[PDB]
Every structure is written in C-alpha cells, then in structure tokens.
C-alpha cells in the first residue's frame, strides 16, 4: 500500500508492542525502494531490534538450561535451542538482505550510511553469538570498520550515531573477538574525544550523547576489572 499507511501502522504496532507487525510494515516500506527518513529509519531499527532481541533472550535462557542440565531435559533444551536459533538466523538474514539490497546502496546521506553499516555489523554480531563463525565474524568487523571510518570523516565525536557505533564496535571486540585491550582502547578514545567537545554539543542531542557516553564508561569500568 502507500508507504505512509505502512509507516502509520508501524507506529500503532509499536504502541501495541506488536514488533513482528512493526518489522513487517517497515520491511514493506523498505522494499518499496525509496530511502527512509530518519523517522522511518529509526522505526525500522526499533522493530528489528525488538524482534531479534526477543529471540536472543530466548536463546540465552534455553542455552543456560542446556548447560545446567538429566539427559531428557537436556536433549529437549538442545532441540528447542536449535528451533530458536533458526528463527534468529532468519531474522538476521532478513535484515542483512534489506541492508545490502536497499538501504546501504541507496543511502544519499552519510549519517544513514553510517547508521546502516553499524546495523550490518550488529546483525552479523548476533549471528556470531550463536555461530562458518570466522566468516560471520569477519563480516561484522568489516561492516563496523567501514562505518567507523565514514563516521570519523563525517560526524563530530559527540554525534550520537558515532558514539553508538563506537559502543557496539567495542562490545564486538570484547565479546566476539575476546580482545579486551582493543575494546577498551576504542571505548576510551571515543569517550575522551566526545568529552573534549561537549561544550559545543547541541542541547537537542545532549541527553542522547551523554547517555551513550555513560554506557561507554559503564563498560570500561566493568572491563578493567
């Protein structure tokens, strides 16, 4: 239908906490081919984050049941983990295809290009949490790195999209690459450069930027024992 009808139902879906609906709406909007506005882009990302989020959380619970187990309960946990895993990969492959075929190629805005390349790193990272794995981990690193390079060239270190990219890239280094030093090095540099320039950050983005900066410092504190 009309993109603006699909966008309106995506927001009604989000109020209803019906995130599968929200994603399908925004998937349809995206497959129409016109690039997304900032509103449409963030609606897309919210939808798929909650959609995949629900499965990542179910995957965590069932794995931990599988590990803590009693032959039968374990075999049942293992099979149900594989059922959830298959949905998880389908959702990630769904997002990754939209990013590759519509969003990254058509983005006329550097900020959207960074947003979408961060997102491709995110969903490859979710694949890598359950993953063959070497290939997926390389896909995640390369998407994050390209996103990071454009962000240093196009955005101020206090920009929330850049700050959020550095957050997830350092999570990628700590949790997926088991590389605390690079994780810490990326997060400290991103925090320090932002803090050196807070004095001139717009009041409209100050909350979101300092919020992410707080998360960076939360991680560094935990990471450095």
């Amino acid at each position: 239908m009309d993109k603006n009808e699909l966008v309106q139902k995506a927001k009604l879906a989000e109020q209803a906490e019906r995130y599968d609906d929200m994603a399908a709406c925004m998937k349809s909007v995206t497959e129409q081919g016109a690039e997304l506005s900032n509103e449409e882009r963030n609606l897309l990302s919210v939808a798929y984050k909650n959609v995949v989020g629900a499965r990542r959380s179910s995957w965590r619970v069932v794995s931990s049941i599988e590990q803590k187990t009693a032959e039968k309960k374990q075999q049942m946990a293992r099979e149900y983990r594989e059922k959830i895993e298959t949905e998880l990969r389908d959702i990630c492959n769904d997002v990754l295809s939209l990013l590759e075929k519509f969003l990254i190629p058509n983005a006329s805005q550097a900020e959207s290009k960074v947003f979408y390349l961060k997102m491709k790193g995110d969903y490859y990272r979710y694949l890598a949490e359950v993953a063959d794995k070497k290939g997926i981990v390389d896909q995640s690193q390369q998407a994050y790195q390209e996103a990071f390079e454009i962000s240093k060239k196009e955005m101020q270190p206090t920009h929330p999209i850049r700050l959020g990219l550095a957050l997830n890239f350092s999570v990628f280094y700590y949790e997926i690459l088991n590389s605390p030093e690079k994780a810490c090095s990326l997060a400290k540099t991103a925090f320090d450069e932002a803090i050196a320039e807070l004095d001139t950050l717009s009041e409209e983005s100050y909350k979101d930027s300092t919020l992410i900066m707080q998360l960076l410092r939360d991680n560094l504190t935990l990471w450095t024992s």
Binding site: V46, G164, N168, Y174, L215, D218, N219, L222
Partner: peptide, 6 residues
C-alpha cells in the same frame, strides 16, 4: 557487556 539500547 552493555550494547546500545533502543
């Protein structure tokens, strides 16, 4: 580790 929230 904490990643970016919604």
């Amino acid at each position: 580790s904490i990643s970016l929230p919604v």
